[PDB]
Amino acid sequence: QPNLYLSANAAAVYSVENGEALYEQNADKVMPIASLSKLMTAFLVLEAVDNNELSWDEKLDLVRLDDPSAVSLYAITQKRTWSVRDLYSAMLTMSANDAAETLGDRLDGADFPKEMNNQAKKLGMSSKTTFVSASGLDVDGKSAVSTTKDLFLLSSKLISTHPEVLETTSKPTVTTDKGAKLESTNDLLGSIQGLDGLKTGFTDEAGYCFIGTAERGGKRVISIVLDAGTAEKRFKDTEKLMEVGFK
Numbered sequence: 441q442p443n444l445y446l447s448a449n450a451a452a453v454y455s456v457e458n459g460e461a462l463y464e465q466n467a468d469k470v471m472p473i474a475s476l477s478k479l480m481t482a483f484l485v486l487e488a489v490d491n492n493e494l495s496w497d498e499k500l501d502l503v504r505l506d507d508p509s510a511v512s513l514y515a516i517t518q519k520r521t522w523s524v525r526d527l528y529s530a531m532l533t534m535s536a537n538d539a540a541e542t543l544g545d546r547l548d549g550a551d552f553p554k555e556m557n558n559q560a561k562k563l564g565m566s567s568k569t570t571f572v573s574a575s576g577l578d579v580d581g582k583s584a585v586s587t588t589k590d591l592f593l594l595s596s597k598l599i600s601t602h603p604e605v606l607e608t609t610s611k612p613t614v615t616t617d618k619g620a621k622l623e624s625t626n627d628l629l630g631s632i633q634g635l636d637g638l639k640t641g642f643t644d645e646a647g648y649c650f651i652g653t654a655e656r657g658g659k660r661v662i663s664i665v666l667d668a669g670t671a672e673k674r675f676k677d678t679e680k681l682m683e684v685g686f687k
Protein backbone atom coordinates (compact mmCIF):
# COMPACT_ATOMS: atom_id res chain seq x y z
CA GLN A 441 0.00 0.00 0.00
CA PRO A 442 1.16 3.58 -0.62
CA ASN A 443 3.10 5.42 2.08
CA LEU A 444 0.74 8.26 3.04
CA TYR A 445 1.34 10.85 5.77
CA LEU A 446 -2.20 11.47 6.95
CA SER A 447 -3.48 13.67 9.74
CA ALA A 448 -6.15 11.07 10.53
CA ASN A 449 -5.62 8.50 13.26
CA ALA A 450 -7.63 5.93 11.30
CA ALA A 451 -8.20 6.04 7.54
CA ALA A 452 -8.80 3.84 4.52
CA VAL A 453 -10.01 3.76 0.94
CA TYR A 454 -11.87 0.83 -0.60
CA SER A 455 -13.00 -0.20 -4.06
CA VAL A 456 -16.76 -0.74 -4.10
CA GLU A 457 -16.93 -3.50 -6.72
CA ASN A 458 -14.93 -5.98 -4.64
CA GLY A 459 -14.64 -4.40 -1.17
CA GLU A 460 -10.85 -4.48 -1.54
CA ALA A 461 -8.71 -2.22 0.62
CA LEU A 462 -6.44 0.10 -1.37
CA TYR A 463 -5.06 1.83 1.70
CA GLU A 464 -5.70 1.07 5.37
CA GLN A 465 -4.41 2.53 8.63
CA ASN A 466 -5.87 1.43 11.98
CA ALA A 467 -8.80 0.07 9.97
CA ASP A 468 -10.01 -2.20 12.82
CA LYS A 469 -9.54 0.34 15.61
CA VAL A 470 -12.72 1.33 17.45
CA MET A 471 -13.22 5.09 16.99
CA PRO A 472 -15.98 7.55 17.97
CA ILE A 473 -17.90 8.47 14.82
CA ALA A 474 -20.25 11.34 15.93
CA SER A 475 -22.31 12.74 12.99
CA LEU A 476 -21.28 9.93 10.65
CA SER A 477 -24.14 8.12 12.46
CA LYS A 478 -26.51 10.22 10.31
CA LEU A 479 -25.70 7.92 7.38
CA MET A 480 -27.48 5.14 9.27
CA THR A 481 -30.37 7.45 10.09
CA ALA A 482 -30.57 8.36 6.39
CA PHE A 483 -30.56 4.64 5.54
CA LEU A 484 -33.50 3.98 7.82
CA VAL A 485 -35.44 7.02 6.54
CA LEU A 486 -35.15 5.76 2.95
CA GLU A 487 -36.02 2.22 4.06
CA ALA A 488 -39.18 3.59 5.71
CA VAL A 489 -40.31 5.57 2.67
CA ASP A 490 -39.82 2.45 0.55
CA ASN A 491 -41.70 0.34 3.08
CA ASN A 492 -44.68 2.76 2.86
CA GLU A 493 -44.13 3.74 6.51
CA LEU A 494 -43.05 7.36 6.02
CA SER A 495 -44.10 10.25 3.79
CA TRP A 496 -41.61 12.71 2.30
CA ASP A 497 -44.17 15.50 2.84
CA GLU A 498 -45.16 14.66 6.44
CA LYS A 499 -44.53 17.71 8.66
CA LEU A 500 -42.58 17.29 11.92
CA ASP A 501 -41.58 19.58 14.78
CA LEU A 502 -37.84 19.83 15.42
CA VAL A 503 -36.96 18.36 18.80
CA ARG A 504 -35.02 20.56 21.22
CA LEU A 505 -31.37 19.60 21.64
CA ASP A 506 -30.05 18.82 25.11
CA ASP A 507 -26.91 20.85 24.32
CA PRO A 508 -27.54 24.33 22.83
CA SER A 509 -24.05 24.29 21.27
CA ALA A 510 -24.62 21.49 18.74
CA VAL A 511 -25.27 22.51 15.14
CA SER A 512 -29.02 22.75 14.54
CA LEU A 513 -31.53 23.67 11.86
CA TYR A 514 -33.72 25.70 14.24
CA ALA A 515 -30.83 27.98 15.20
CA ILE A 516 -30.18 29.29 11.69
CA THR A 517 -33.84 29.48 10.57
CA GLN A 518 -35.98 29.99 13.72
CA LYS A 519 -38.53 27.67 12.05
CA ARG A 520 -39.89 24.76 14.08
CA THR A 521 -41.83 22.66 11.52
CA TRP A 522 -40.36 20.94 8.48
CA SER A 523 -41.18 18.16 6.05
CA VAL A 524 -39.41 14.82 6.33
CA ARG A 525 -37.73 15.62 3.00
CA ASP A 526 -36.32 18.87 4.39
CA LEU A 527 -35.18 17.28 7.67
CA TYR A 528 -33.42 14.56 5.67
CA SER A 529 -31.75 17.19 3.49
CA ALA A 530 -30.69 19.21 6.54
CA MET A 531 -29.33 16.11 8.27
CA LEU A 532 -27.14 15.14 5.30
CA THR A 533 -26.14 18.61 4.02
CA MET A 534 -25.45 20.82 7.06
CA SER A 535 -25.40 18.00 9.66
CA ALA A 536 -28.39 19.42 11.54
CA ASN A 537 -28.44 17.50 14.82
CA ASP A 538 -32.04 18.39 15.63
CA ALA A 539 -33.22 17.21 12.21
CA ALA A 540 -31.66 13.76 12.72
CA GLU A 541 -33.13 13.30 16.21
CA THR A 542 -36.51 14.38 14.86
CA LEU A 543 -36.39 11.72 12.13
CA GLY A 544 -35.33 8.99 14.54
CA ASP A 545 -38.13 9.88 16.94
CA ARG A 546 -40.70 9.73 14.13
CA LEU A 547 -39.35 6.39 12.92
CA ASP A 548 -39.08 4.41 16.15
CA GLY A 549 -39.38 6.78 19.13
CA ALA A 550 -37.14 5.83 22.04
CA ASP A 551 -36.41 2.55 20.25
CA PHE A 552 -34.50 4.05 17.34
CA PRO A 553 -31.00 3.01 18.58
CA LYS A 554 -32.06 -0.64 18.54
CA GLU A 555 -33.19 -0.23 14.93
CA MET A 556 -29.93 1.53 14.03
CA ASN A 557 -27.90 -1.35 15.45
CA ASN A 558 -30.16 -4.05 14.02
CA GLN A 559 -29.63 -2.48 10.62
CA ALA A 560 -25.87 -2.38 11.29
CA LYS A 561 -25.80 -6.15 11.80
CA LYS A 562 -28.01 -6.66 8.75
CA LEU A 563 -25.51 -4.59 6.73
CA GLY A 564 -22.56 -6.75 7.78
CA MET A 565 -21.10 -4.34 10.34
CA SER A 566 -19.11 -5.96 13.15
CA SER A 567 -20.02 -6.02 16.84
CA LYS A 568 -17.49 -3.17 17.25
CA THR A 569 -20.13 -0.78 15.85
CA THR A 570 -22.65 0.65 18.32
CA PHE A 571 -24.96 3.56 17.55
CA VAL A 572 -26.48 5.55 20.40
CA SER A 573 -28.56 8.26 18.66
CA ALA A 574 -29.86 9.31 15.27
CA SER A 575 -27.51 12.32 15.23
CA GLY A 576 -24.50 10.65 16.81
CA LEU A 577 -24.61 12.97 19.82
CA ASP A 578 -23.69 11.23 23.07
CA VAL A 579 -26.53 9.68 25.09
CA ASP A 580 -26.12 9.40 28.89
CA GLY A 581 -22.36 9.47 28.36
CA LYS A 582 -22.27 6.67 25.75
CA SER A 583 -20.67 7.41 22.38
CA ALA A 584 -21.33 6.15 18.88
CA VAL A 585 -18.35 4.07 17.76
CA SER A 586 -17.32 2.07 14.72
CA THR A 587 -14.25 1.11 12.67
CA THR A 588 -13.19 2.24 9.20
CA LYS A 589 -13.99 -1.21 7.75
CA ASP A 590 -17.47 -1.13 9.28
CA LEU A 591 -18.15 2.40 8.03
CA PHE A 592 -17.21 1.27 4.52
CA LEU A 593 -19.73 -1.58 4.75
CA LEU A 594 -22.41 0.85 5.90
CA SER A 595 -21.53 3.44 3.24
CA SER A 596 -21.29 0.93 0.39
CA LYS A 597 -24.56 -0.74 1.42
CA LEU A 598 -26.30 2.63 1.72
CA ILE A 599 -25.21 3.71 -1.77
CA SER A 600 -26.03 0.36 -3.38
CA THR A 601 -29.40 0.06 -1.64
CA HIS A 602 -30.41 3.73 -2.03
CA PRO A 603 -28.32 5.37 -4.77
CA GLU A 604 -30.60 8.41 -4.67
CA VAL A 605 -28.80 9.35 -1.45
CA LEU A 606 -26.14 10.72 -3.81
CA GLU A 607 -28.67 13.11 -5.39
CA THR A 608 -28.59 14.91 -2.07
CA THR A 609 -24.96 14.50 -0.95
CA SER A 610 -23.62 15.61 -4.36
CA LYS A 611 -25.13 19.09 -4.06
CA PRO A 612 -23.03 21.89 -2.50
CA THR A 613 -26.30 23.67 -1.66
CA VAL A 614 -29.75 22.14 -1.21
CA THR A 615 -32.79 24.41 -1.51
CA THR A 616 -35.36 22.96 0.85
CA ASP A 617 -39.08 22.56 0.20
CA LYS A 618 -39.71 25.41 2.65
CA GLY A 619 -37.19 27.66 0.91
CA ALA A 620 -34.14 27.81 3.17
CA LYS A 621 -30.83 27.18 1.41
CA LEU A 622 -28.54 24.77 3.27
CA GLU A 623 -24.81 24.74 2.53
CA SER A 624 -22.96 21.44 2.33
CA THR A 625 -20.17 20.74 4.81
CA ASN A 626 -18.48 18.69 2.06
CA ASP A 627 -15.80 21.17 0.96
CA LEU A 628 -14.57 18.72 -1.69
CA LEU A 629 -17.60 18.93 -4.00
CA GLY A 630 -16.35 20.49 -7.24
CA SER A 631 -12.75 19.90 -6.16
CA ILE A 632 -12.17 16.18 -6.73
CA GLN A 633 -13.52 14.99 -10.08
CA GLY A 634 -16.39 12.52 -9.64
CA LEU A 635 -16.71 13.00 -5.88
CA ASP A 636 -20.38 13.05 -4.88
CA GLY A 637 -20.54 12.13 -1.15
CA LEU A 638 -20.72 11.43 1.59
CA LYS A 639 -20.67 12.89 5.12
CA THR A 640 -18.58 14.94 7.56
CA GLY A 641 -18.33 14.68 11.32
CA PHE A 642 -16.62 16.45 14.20
CA THR A 643 -16.47 16.37 17.96
CA ASP A 644 -13.55 17.07 20.26
CA GLU A 645 -13.32 13.33 20.93
CA ALA A 646 -13.89 12.17 17.34
CA GLY A 647 -11.66 14.79 15.74
CA TYR A 648 -12.50 15.89 12.22
CA CYS A 649 -13.95 13.06 10.14
CA PHE A 650 -15.13 12.54 6.58
CA ILE A 651 -16.59 9.71 4.52
CA GLY A 652 -16.09 10.47 0.85
CA THR A 653 -17.12 8.68 -2.32
CA ALA A 654 -16.30 9.27 -5.98
CA GLU A 655 -16.93 7.49 -9.25
CA ARG A 656 -14.95 7.61 -12.50
CA GLY A 657 -15.54 5.39 -15.52
CA GLY A 658 -17.59 2.82 -13.62
CA LYS A 659 -15.17 2.53 -10.68
CA ARG A 660 -16.45 3.91 -7.35
CA VAL A 661 -14.34 4.15 -4.20
CA ILE A 662 -15.17 5.06 -0.61
CA SER A 663 -12.67 6.81 1.65
CA ILE A 664 -12.89 6.98 5.47
CA VAL A 665 -10.98 9.56 7.54
CA LEU A 666 -11.31 9.54 11.33
CA ASP A 667 -9.72 11.92 13.85
CA ALA A 668 -7.89 14.30 11.53
CA GLY A 669 -6.45 17.38 13.20
CA THR A 670 -8.38 20.23 11.56
CA ALA A 671 -11.48 20.86 9.48
CA GLU A 672 -9.41 21.15 6.34
CA LYS A 673 -6.91 18.32 7.10
CA ARG A 674 -9.69 15.70 6.86
CA PHE A 675 -10.13 16.82 3.25
CA LYS A 676 -6.39 16.94 2.57
CA ASP A 677 -6.30 13.33 3.80
CA THR A 678 -9.27 12.53 1.57
CA GLU A 679 -7.47 14.02 -1.45
CA LYS A 680 -4.58 11.65 -0.74
CA LEU A 681 -6.89 8.64 -0.38
CA MET A 682 -8.79 9.43 -3.57
CA GLU A 683 -5.59 9.60 -5.63
CA VAL A 684 -4.68 6.18 -4.24
CA GLY A 685 -8.20 4.99 -4.95
CA PHE A 686 -7.99 5.76 -8.66
CA LYS A 687 -4.36 4.77 -9.25
Ligand SMILES: *C(=O)[C@@H](NC(=O)Cc1ccccc1)[C@@H]1N[C@@H](C(=O)O)C(C)(C)S1
Pocket residue numbers: 473474475476507509510511534535537576625640641642643
Ligand atom coordinates in the same frame (compact mmCIF):
# COMPACT_ATOMS: atom_id res chain seq x y z
C1 LIG B 1 -21.55 15.68 14.03
O1 LIG B 1 -20.43 15.31 14.24
C2 LIG B 1 -22.04 17.07 14.51
N1 LIG B 1 -21.08 17.59 15.48
C3 LIG B 1 -21.47 18.56 16.48
O2 LIG B 1 -22.59 18.98 16.54
C4 LIG B 1 -20.37 19.05 17.42
C5 LIG B 1 -20.95 19.54 18.74
C6 LIG B 1 -20.83 20.87 19.08
C7 LIG B 1 -21.34 21.32 20.28
C8 LIG B 1 -21.97 20.42 21.14
C9 LIG B 1 -22.08 19.08 20.80
C10 LIG B 1 -21.57 18.63 19.59
C11 LIG B 1 -22.20 17.97 13.32
N2 LIG B 1 -21.21 17.37 12.21
C12 LIG B 1 -20.07 18.29 12.16
C13 LIG B 1 -19.51 18.22 10.86
O3 LIG B 1 -20.25 17.85 9.90
O4 LIG B 1 -18.30 18.52 10.67
C14 LIG B 1 -20.70 19.80 12.51
C15 LIG B 1 -19.59 20.65 13.11
C16 LIG B 1 -21.18 20.47 11.22
S1 LIG B 1 -21.80 19.61 13.47
